[PDB]
Design an enzyme around this catalytic site. Structure first.
Site, PDB file in Angstrom:
ATOM      1  N   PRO A  94      52.833  22.545  25.255  1.00 32.45           N
ATOM      2  CA  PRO A  94      51.505  22.091  25.327  1.00 32.45           C
ATOM      3  C   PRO A  94      50.607  22.632  24.157  1.00 32.45           C
ATOM      4  O   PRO A  94      49.374  21.955  24.293  1.00 32.45           O
ATOM      5  CB  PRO A  94      51.114  22.665  26.524  1.00 32.45           C
ATOM      6  CG  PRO A  94      52.136  23.449  27.049  1.00 32.45           C
ATOM      7  CD  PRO A  94      53.411  23.608  26.137  1.00 32.45           C
ATOM      8  N   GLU A 121      58.256  31.815  30.726  1.00 33.43           N
ATOM      9  CA  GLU A 121      57.005  31.784  30.013  1.00 33.43           C
ATOM     10  C   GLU A 121      56.929  31.212  28.731  1.00 33.43           C
ATOM     11  O   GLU A 121      55.874  30.988  28.178  1.00 33.43           O
ATOM     12  CB  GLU A 121      56.454  33.150  30.128  1.00 33.43           C
ATOM     13  CG  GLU A 121      56.925  33.994  31.513  1.00 33.43           C
ATOM     14  CD  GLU A 121      56.004  32.896  32.669  1.00 33.43           C
ATOM     15  OE1 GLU A 121      55.204  32.388  32.436  1.00 33.43           O
ATOM     16  OE2 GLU A 121      57.012  32.837  33.413  1.00 33.43           O
ATOM     17  N   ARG A 159      63.428   3.384  23.090  1.00 33.15           N
ATOM     18  CA  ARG A 159      63.302   1.937  23.453  1.00 33.15           C
ATOM     19  C   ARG A 159      62.771   1.324  22.251  1.00 33.15           C
ATOM     20  O   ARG A 159      62.506  -0.072  22.432  1.00 33.15           O
ATOM     21  CB  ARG A 159      62.662   1.895  24.695  1.00 33.15           C
ATOM     22  CG  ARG A 159      60.870   2.566  24.134  1.00 33.15           C
ATOM     23  CD  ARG A 159      60.076   2.311  25.441  1.00 33.15           C
ATOM     24  NE  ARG A 159      59.796   1.050  25.619  1.00 33.15           N
ATOM     25  CZ  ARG A 159      58.857   0.013  25.290  1.00 33.15           C
ATOM     26  NH1 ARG A 159      58.198   0.720  24.284  1.00 33.15           N
ATOM     27  NH2 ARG A 159      58.813  -0.969  26.057  1.00 33.15           N
ATOM     28  N   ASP A 168      53.625  -4.007  23.643  1.00 28.97           N
ATOM     29  CA  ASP A 168      53.366  -2.702  24.317  1.00 28.97           C
ATOM     30  C   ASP A 168      51.735  -2.149  24.264  1.00 28.97           C
ATOM     31  O   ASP A 168      51.195  -2.800  23.337  1.00 28.97           O
ATOM     32  CB  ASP A 168      54.144  -1.544  23.442  1.00 28.97           C
ATOM     33  CG  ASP A 168      55.570  -1.342  24.034  1.00 28.97           C
ATOM     34  OD1 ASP A 168      56.099  -1.771  24.837  1.00 28.97           O
ATOM     35  OD2 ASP A 168      56.301  -0.701  23.149  1.00 28.97           O
TER      36      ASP A 168
HETATM   37  N1  SAH Z   1      52.526   6.484  29.865  1.00 30.72           N
HETATM   38  C1  SAH Z   1      52.787   6.431  30.912  1.00 30.72           C
HETATM   39  N2  SAH Z   1      52.524   6.741  31.867  1.00 30.72           N
HETATM   40  C2  SAH Z   1      52.841   6.287  33.090  1.00 30.72           C
HETATM   41  N3  SAH Z   1      53.765   5.413  33.345  1.00 30.72           N
HETATM   42  C3  SAH Z   1      54.278   4.758  32.420  1.00 30.72           C
HETATM   43  C4  SAH Z   1      53.990   5.305  30.941  1.00 30.72           C
HETATM   44  N4  SAH Z   1      54.685   4.521  30.037  1.00 30.72           N
HETATM   45  C5  SAH Z   1      55.500   3.905  30.975  1.00 30.72           C
HETATM   46  N5  SAH Z   1      55.231   3.597  32.187  1.00 30.72           N
HETATM   47  C6  SAH Z   1      55.240   2.828  33.379  1.00 30.72           C
HETATM   48  O1  SAH Z   1      56.750   2.308  33.066  1.00 30.72           O
HETATM   49  C7  SAH Z   1      57.215   0.999  33.339  1.00 30.72           C
HETATM   50  C8  SAH Z   1      57.572   0.307  32.061  1.00 30.72           C
HETATM   51  S1  SAH Z   1      56.584   0.282  30.801  1.00 30.72           S
HETATM   52  C9  SAH Z   1      55.766  -1.269  30.881  1.00 30.72           C
HETATM   53  C10 SAH Z   1      54.570  -1.022  29.957  1.00 30.72           C
HETATM   54  C11 SAH Z   1      53.588  -2.161  29.945  1.00 30.72           C
HETATM   55  N6  SAH Z   1      53.968  -3.334  29.158  1.00 30.72           N
HETATM   56  C12 SAH Z   1      52.299  -1.660  29.375  1.00 30.72           C
HETATM   57  O2  SAH Z   1      52.223  -1.823  28.150  1.00 30.72           O
HETATM   58  O3  SAH Z   1      51.289  -1.288  29.901  1.00 30.72           O
HETATM   59  C13 SAH Z   1      55.781   0.649  33.979  1.00 30.72           C
HETATM   60  O4  SAH Z   1      55.768   0.795  35.265  1.00 30.72           O
HETATM   61  C14 SAH Z   1      54.842   1.683  33.244  1.00 30.72           C
HETATM   62  O5  SAH Z   1      53.654   1.873  34.174  1.00 30.72           O
HETATM   63  N1  SAH Z   2      52.798  19.449  28.327  1.00 30.05           N
HETATM   64  C1  SAH Z   2      53.870  19.812  27.909  1.00 30.05           C
HETATM   65  N2  SAH Z   2      54.285  19.445  26.778  1.00 30.05           N
HETATM   66  C2  SAH Z   2      55.517  19.809  26.211  1.00 30.05           C
HETATM   67  N3  SAH Z   2      56.194  20.975  26.571  1.00 30.05           N
HETATM   68  C3  SAH Z   2      55.769  21.290  27.538  1.00 30.05           C
HETATM   69  C4  SAH Z   2      54.670  21.001  28.398  1.00 30.05           C
HETATM   70  N4  SAH Z   2      54.390  21.925  29.452  1.00 30.05           N
HETATM   71  C5  SAH Z   2      55.427  22.694  29.509  1.00 30.05           C
HETATM   72  N5  SAH Z   2      56.213  22.444  28.109  1.00 30.05           N
HETATM   73  C6  SAH Z   2      57.150  23.529  27.945  1.00 30.05           C
HETATM   74  O1  SAH Z   2      57.863  24.005  28.974  1.00 30.05           O
HETATM   75  C7  SAH Z   2      58.457  25.127  28.674  1.00 30.05           C
HETATM   76  C8  SAH Z   2      58.256  26.211  30.010  1.00 30.05           C
HETATM   77  S1  SAH Z   2      56.548  26.524  30.373  1.00 30.05           S
HETATM   78  C9  SAH Z   2      55.856  27.705  29.475  1.00 30.05           C
HETATM   79  C10 SAH Z   2      54.207  27.443  29.162  1.00 30.05           C
HETATM   80  C11 SAH Z   2      53.598  28.248  28.093  1.00 30.05           C
HETATM   81  N6  SAH Z   2      53.046  29.574  28.648  1.00 30.05           N
HETATM   82  C12 SAH Z   2      52.136  27.595  27.942  1.00 30.05           C
HETATM   83  O2  SAH Z   2      51.127  27.317  28.497  1.00 30.05           O
HETATM   84  O3  SAH Z   2      51.866  27.405  26.505  1.00 30.05           O
HETATM   85  C13 SAH Z   2      57.844  25.569  27.688  1.00 30.05           C
HETATM   86  O4  SAH Z   2      58.775  25.597  26.425  1.00 30.05           O
HETATM   87  C14 SAH Z   2      56.801  24.813  27.081  1.00 30.05           C
HETATM   88  O5  SAH Z   2      56.462  24.500  25.708  1.00 30.05           O
END
Ligand code: SAH
Ligand code: SAH
Lengths: 239, 239
Positions: A94, A121, A159, A168
């Site tokens: 994060p 953690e 993809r 997209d």
């Molecule tokens: N960032 C994201 N967050 C949530 N759902 C996601 C997502 N990316 C893809 N999906 C979901 O994955 C499925 C296939 S992707 C279809 C994407 C569409 N052409 C557009 O560009 O908006 C869809 O139901 C879409 O809602």
């Molecule tokens: N939003 C997110 N994007 C990418 N990696 C994530 C994420 N949420 C959790 N992770 C990963 O999941 C693992 C366990 S969670 C550890 C969380 C950390 N204490 C913090 O808040 O920074 C970690 O490697 C963390 O980097």
């Protein structure tokens, strides 16, 4: 043959993307390769511990640097033997830069990735300092592990690889337009007639106005940063 | 006993969160329940079709999803859930974040719709979907990974699932670096404050690290943080 290696305590989780959908067909066709490396295979002791209590106190456990270092070296050697010129190590966190379409487009050019998936953690900071090239976040929320973020990153790349998308969302800075398919009428709601079977050109016009209006309603800051072709500018001023 | 139903062509993918890690332990302990509904069990067996207006790809048909969502709704009522919204995962939705995750914890349960291909028929969304959520500004090949991201983020904040107060974004700041054995890794020492410090100076150090890291990496987040007077004192003691 894009090379992916994931450092993960739960290799089976990656079956979610190697065994299903378009990403699975890509793995099965060898367009991509996903290899899972378990840090417990590089740990010491009868229990193969990869976690330990944090310096300074505090709850939870911290992943030890030494098994992860060995797992990353192995992954680096796997990638070199696979013919890759260079594969950067990405740590899902994060605290990394926020994944978006621009980042995805850059990742597509890579020979491959080594993706480090944390648990507990998190990971000892010195391991990150010495072994990680890039930190990426999939969003401003906290997950229990880095495997799902890794899978999100991997899926978003796979993809867009050749022989595995022009409309997209975010590809052109606008959101995709609403989609319609059979039946002709659904619960009293009809398809807009323009789309039904009119000519190729006028359908395209409607699609752009829908992308712009939808982007305007939901994500107006993106309208600030969008560049329009002359045909698109013409359409807007007409409304 | 929070109730989750996911509408998905690939129910097996959800094994990634019900069979592994902390989310898996919750499912095995019956703290949560995840039920998968495949739209193919409600078709007359096509579930996707070509989009009106031409264009590449396939659009998921409304009628099987309508039947699947209704089945999901009756499944949720028979589980005793009072408030279950239908959520559609989509990049055109509001962006999930930690504040949003906290709100989800208040629901009796969730019905989550996972689209595939070019997406879901717009009219199905209009009539059956209460909320649209995006996990980020990128496009994945399906809604299953976003659904899992949402589920995992919720599950780890449920009671009986200690070590969540120190999460990133919980107080608006990023987490501070973590350390564990060995004392020295490849020339790098644990900061001495953590090695031999005590309650007050460790807590001071951890906060200054959270603040500085947020300032270096996510400077816009500092705008939205409110500091205790003790933290305000600590900052001024540096600057
Ligand atoms: N960032 C994201 N967050 C949530 N759902 C996601 C997502 N990316 C893809 N999906 C979901 O994955 C499925 C296939 S992707 C279809 C994407 C569409 N052409 C557009 O560009 O908006 C869809 O139901 C879409 O809602
Ligand atoms: N939003 C997110 N994007 C990418 N990696 C994530 C994420 N949420 C959790 N992770 C990963 O999941 C693992 C366990 S969670 C550890 C969380 C950390 N204490 C913090 O808040 O920074 C970690 O490697 C963390 O980097």
């Amino acid at each position: 043959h894009v090379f992916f290696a994931v450092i993960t305590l739960f290799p089976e989780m990656f079956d979610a993307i190697t065994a299903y959908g378009i990403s699975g067909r890509a793995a099965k066709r060898d367009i991509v390769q996903v290899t899972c490396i378990n840090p417990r295979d590089f740990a010491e002791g009868n229990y193969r511990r990869v976690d330990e209590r944090p310096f300074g106190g505090g709850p939870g456990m911290v992943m030890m640097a030494e098994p992860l270092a060995k797992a990353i070296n192995h992954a680096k050697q796997l990638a070199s033997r696979a013919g890759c010129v260079h594969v950067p190590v990405v740590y899902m966190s994060p605290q990394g830069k926020t994944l978006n379409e621009q980042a995805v487009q850059q990742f597509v050019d890579y020979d491959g990735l080594i993706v480090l998936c944390g648990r507990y953690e998190g990971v000892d900071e010195r391991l990150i300092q010495h072994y990680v090239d890039q930190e990426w976040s999939i969003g401003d929320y906290v997950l229990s592990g880095g495997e799902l973020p890794a899978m999100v990153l991997l899926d978003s790349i796979i993809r867009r690889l050749p022989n595995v998308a022009i409309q997209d969302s975010f590809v052109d800075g606008l959101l995709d337009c609403p989609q319609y398919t059979k039946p002709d009428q659904f619960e009293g709601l009809d398809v807009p007639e323009i789309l039904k079977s009119g000519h190729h050109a006028n359908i395209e016009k409607w699609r752009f106005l829908q992308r712009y209006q939808r982007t305007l309603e939901r994500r107006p800051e993106l309208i600030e940063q969008v560049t329009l072709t002359k045909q698109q500018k013409k359409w807007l001023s007409d409304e």
